[PDB]
């Protein structure tokens, strides 16, 4: 119950962090392409 | 941003019962306010109720009203996948299953209508598809369906389909999964989706089919075969 919820919260945190990183990379790549 | 009061314009109306007026369901009216705020501020990204202090407004609601109010945030942040997560994360980890399900649906809504290579909707909502909480199942299924409506994504479809046949799935979850599959495979005549829906319909009893939530399975098949 509580342990499962904590594990799910950690997994979602990690996934969100990875997603934000990937999106920042995508945004900067798009900006670089537009500048080019 | 426009708050619901601006739309309501109560002061114009003749305030005959400005004192001890009719006692309406305050929770229901708060839910109506949340829906109105979402609709009025849809796609703009700024809101004067959830953004300034969202926890207060959310806890103002009751039961599922919290789920709908949380999804309203994604409705507001529509088409802003990049900014959707940085705002919905606060509510993605909440002590209330209703709020977490609403955050899942909000992410799905935010991704709806736009396509990224990061597949944020899948990445976030593939975890809670089979979770033991039916409310979270509902939120995740509907979010995925709205995020990938009209896409015909085989990975998402194969992820979603077992939910219909899963034992620990209420009629509500079964119907919502049928709806999500229909939206994902609209105008595709998917053999997998049609076979799964037909098997699910046949597997149930007359008493179970008397439920109104079961009306969402034929709707799923029709959406699959639309046009």
Select the residue of B81, B82, B89 nearest A16 (Cβ to Cβ).
B89
Q: How far apart are CA B31 and CA B9, in angstroms?
A: 18
What DSSP element (H or E) covers A32? helix A2-35
Q: Which of B55, B73, B53, B5 is nearest to B33 (CA)?
A: B5
Residue B202's alpha-carbon distances to A18, B173, B174, in angstroms, are: 42, 17, 13
Select the residue of A19, A26, A27 nearest B123 (Cβ to Cβ).
A19
User: Could you please report the per-residue DSSP string of B25-49?
Assistant: -HHHHHHHHHHHHHHHTTTT---SS
Select the residue of B82, B85, B116 nearest A16 (Cβ to Cβ).
B85
> How far is C-alpha B207 from the chain's CA centre?
27
> Hey, what are B69's tokens?
């109010």
Q: How far apart are CA B176 and CA B152, in angstroms?
A: 17
Q: Three-class SS of residue B129?
A: coil
User: Could you please report the per-residue DSSP string of B84-117?
Assistant: HHHHHHHHHS-S-HHHHHHHHHHHHHHHTT---S
Q: Which of B39, B57, B47 is nearest to B87 (CA)?
A: B47
Q: How far apart are CA B214 and CA B22, in angstroms?
A: 36
Q: Which of B190, B141, B127 is nearest to B170 (CA)?
A: B141
List Cβ neighbours of B102 (8 Å cut-off, separation of 6 or more). Answer: B66, B67, B68, B69, B70, B71, B73, B91, B139
Helix-strand-coil percent breakdown of chain B, rounded to 5? 65, 0, 35
Chosen for mutation from A7, A10, A11, A19 (greatest number of chain B CBs closer than 10 Å) is: A19
Q: A13 CB near a chain B CB, below 8 Å?
A: yes
Select the residue of B117, B118, B127 nearest A11 (Cβ to Cβ).
B127
In this complex, do A12 and B127 lie within 8 Å of one another by their Cβ atoms? yes
In SS3 terms, B65-91 reads as: HHHHHHHHHHHHCCCCHHHHHHHHHHH
User: Environment class of residue B201 by beta-carbon count within 10 Å: exposed (0-12), middle (13-18) or buried (19+)?
Assistant: middle
Instruction: Judge contact between B34 and B65, C-beta under 8 A.
Output: yes
> Hey, what are B108's tokens?
């799905």
B127 to chain A: which residues are within 8 Å by CB? 8, 11-12, 15
B133 to chain A: which residues are within 8 Å by CB? none
Residue contacts between A and B (CB atoms, under 8 Å): 36
B127 phi, psi to nearest 5 deg: -75, -40
Instruction: Judge contact between B184 and B151, C-beta under 8 A.
Output: yes
Q: Obtained via which technique?
A: cryo-EM
Instruction: Judge contact between B47 and B76, C-beta under 8 A.
Output: yes
> Hey, what are B204's tokens?
């149930």
Q: Which of B41, B128, B129 is nearest to B77 (CA)?
A: B41
Residue A6 C-alpha, separation from nearest chain B C-alpha, in angstroms: 9
In this complex, do B86 and A9 lie within 8 Å of one another by their Cβ atoms? no
List A residues 14-33 in contact with B (Cβ-Cβ < 8 A).
15-16, 18-20, 22-23, 26-27
Which residue do the tokens 């103002």 mark?
B60
Neighbours of B12 (CB within 10 A): 7
In this complex, do A26 and B116 lie within 8 Å of one another by their Cβ atoms? yes
List B residues 73-92 in contact with A (Cβ-Cβ < 8 A).
81-82, 85-86, 89, 92
Select the residue of A8, A11, A26 nearest B118 (Cβ to Cβ).
A26
Buried b (16+ CB within 10 A) or exposed e, B21-53: eeeeeeeeebbbbbbbbbebbbeebebebbbee
């Amino acid at each position: 119950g509580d342990r499962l919820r904590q594990t799910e919260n950690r997994a979602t945190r990690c996934k969100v962090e990875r997603l934000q990183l990937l999106l920042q990379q995508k945004r900067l790549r798009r900006k670089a392409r537009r500048d080019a | 941003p426009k708050v619901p009061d601006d739309i309501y314009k109560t002061h114009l109306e003749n305030n005959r019962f400005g004192g001890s007026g009719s006692q309406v369901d305050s929770a229901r009216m708060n839910l109506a306010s949340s829906f109105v705020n979402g609709f009025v501020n849809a796609a703009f990204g700024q809101d004067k109720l959830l953004t300034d202090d969202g926890n207060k407004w959310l806890y103002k609601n009751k039961d599922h009203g919290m789920l709908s109010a949380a999804a309203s945030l994604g409705m507001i942040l529509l088409w802003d996948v990049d900014g959707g997560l940085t705002q919905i994360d606060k509510y993605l980890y909440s002590s209330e299953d209703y709020i977490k399900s609403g955050a899942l649906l909000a992410c799905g809504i935010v991704n709806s209508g736009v396509r990224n290579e990061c597949d944020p909707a899948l990445a976030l909502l593939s975890d809670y598809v089979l979770h033991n909480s039916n409310t979270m199942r509902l939120g995740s299924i509907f979010g995925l369906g709205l995020a990938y409506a009209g896409s015909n994504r085989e990975d998402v479809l194969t992820l979603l389909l077992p939910v219909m046949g899963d034992s620990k799935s209420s009629m509500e979850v079964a119907g919502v999964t049928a709806l999500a599959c229909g939206m994902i495979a609209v105008g595709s005549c998917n053999g997998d989706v049609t076979s799964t829906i037909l098997q699910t319909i046949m597997e149930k009893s007359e008493t179970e089919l008397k439920d109104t939530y079961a009306r969402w399975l034929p709707l799923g098949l029709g959406l699959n075969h639309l046009g």
